């Protein structure tokens, strides 16, 4: 469903800020930062082609740590994203990759949820008062120079010191049950079109730490989509806590090292990885989020009070009605229909998954979340001659159309530059 494109504008980084879709802006609870030039590429969704020194206090220096410090699966370049055509490339890449996602029926579905996925207005200490949470906002510099507060859902931002960072260390005392309480909060995705990962086409090698160089290339659109499915659990508040984890007995090598994997990661991947979330336990999650919804439904029915935007009590009321699929009765009251809850739930946690996105994209991809990366490559998907919205790297009317030759790296070698090999380097 890309008949009308997701980004309707041709964007280049150098364009004069208008204070609307191209504006210096500031993110919440950084009062420090110099305003940053950002771009609104679609309603509720913004893009910040700078590397992220902001959101988290801990990083904020892109300098590489000592080499005795660094783990093999880390990669550091302090100069990346520093120039203009670079940030120009970034906008162009991120844009395409959305359009790609958006031309699949799955992508169209998903993205619609993400737009509709507005963070609940929970800010008030007063239970009968409707209050938007201000962490859910950005602050944008209007053409006059005055600040305007603007509510959003998603931000695509450049990386941090570690470009390939495969896990977050970031989040701890941040008060965000917003992701597990059904509220949702505005998600911040760190992402680079300009890099992607090597992997092996055979299961026995791919799940082996000691074997292979990464013959094939992950399609960044599969990568972006993945964070977007994460983002969707975390906009609706149905995300699973990171400390729920699977101690891995499915792999000798993982198990040897006591590596654990968060249920949220297994769910996000989907496929045959989802049975490793215990059906027993999963129903517990279900009932929880189903009850979490009954709380949002209640809170909605109590509230006679708002904090004025232009918006009335009943306009926003219907916005969250739509978001959670609520059932109103003759008396004007909201409830949670147990059918539509499971509808919504099945959709986010099951229908939208990395596995299925691989189905739509007609691409080669890692068969399981539990596997061992081989390489990281530098890429450029901006030239149409490298990469397209419809065919990705495997380009129709070329020798790369068939047998996944576009992702084939010894064939398309023109299109990739290896940076690191992770093989053998793993902690074993």
């Amino acid at each position: 469903g890309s008949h009308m494109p997701f980004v309707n504008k041709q964007f280049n980084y150098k364009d004069p800020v208008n204070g609307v879709d191209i504006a210096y802006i500031k993110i919440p609870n950084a009062g420090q930062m110099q305003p940053v030039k950002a771009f609104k590429i679609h309603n509720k969704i913004w893009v910040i082609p700078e590397r992220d020194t902001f959101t988290n206090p801990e990083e904020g220096d892109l300098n590489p740590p000592p080499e005795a410090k660094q783990v093999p699966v880390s990669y550091y370049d302090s100069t990346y994203l520093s120039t203009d055509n670079e940030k120009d490339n970034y906008l162009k890449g991120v844009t395409k990759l959305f359009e790609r996602i958006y031309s699949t029926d799955l992508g169209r579905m998903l993205l619609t949820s993400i737009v509709r996925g507005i963070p609940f207005w929970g800010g008030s200490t007063i239970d009968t008062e409707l209050k938007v949470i201000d962490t859910n906002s950005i602050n944008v510099i209007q053409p006059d120079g005055s600040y305007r507060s603007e509510e959003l859902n998603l931000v695509i931002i450049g990386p941090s010191a570690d470009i390939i960072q495969f896990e977050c260390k970031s989040f701890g005392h941040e008060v965000l049950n917003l992701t597990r309480n059904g509220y949702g909060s505005t998600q911040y995705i760190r992402f680079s079109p300009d890099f992607t990962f090597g992997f092996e086409e055979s299961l026995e090698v791919d799940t082996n730490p000691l074997l292979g160089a990464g013959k094939f290339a992950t399609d960044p659109a599969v990568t972006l989509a993945h964070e977007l499915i994460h983002a969707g659990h975390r906009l609706y508040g149905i995300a699973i806590n990171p400390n729920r984890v699977f101690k891995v007995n499915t792999n000798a090598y993982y198990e040897m090292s006591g590596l654990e994997v968060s249920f949220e990661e297994l769910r996000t991947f989907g496929g045959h990885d989802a049975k490793f979330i215990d059906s027993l336990q999963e129903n517990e999650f279900r009932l929880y989020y189903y009850n979490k919804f009954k709380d949002i439904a209640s809170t909605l029915n109590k509230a006679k009070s708002i904090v004025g935007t232009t918006a009335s009590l009943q306009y926003m009321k219907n916005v969250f009605k739509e978001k959670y699929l609520l059932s109103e009765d003759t008396s004007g009251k909201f409830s949670v229909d147990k059918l539509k809850f499971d509808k919504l739930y099945k959709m986010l946690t099951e229908i939208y998954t990395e596995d299925n996105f691989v189905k739509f994209f007609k691409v080669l991809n890692r068969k399981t979340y539990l596997n061992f990366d081989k390489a990281v490559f530098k890429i450029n998907i901006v030239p149409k001659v490298n990469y397209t919205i419809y065919d990705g790297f495997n380009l129709r009317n070329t020798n790369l159309a068939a047998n996944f030759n576009g992702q084939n790296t010894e064939i398309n070698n023109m299109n990739f530059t290896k940076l690191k090999n992770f093989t053998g380097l793993f902690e074993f």
């Binding site: 495969f166 896990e167 990962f197 993945h226 994460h230 994997v261």
Partner: peptide, 5 residues
Amino acid sequence: XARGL
């Protein structure tokens, strides 16, 4: 954030 190892 995450892709994992």
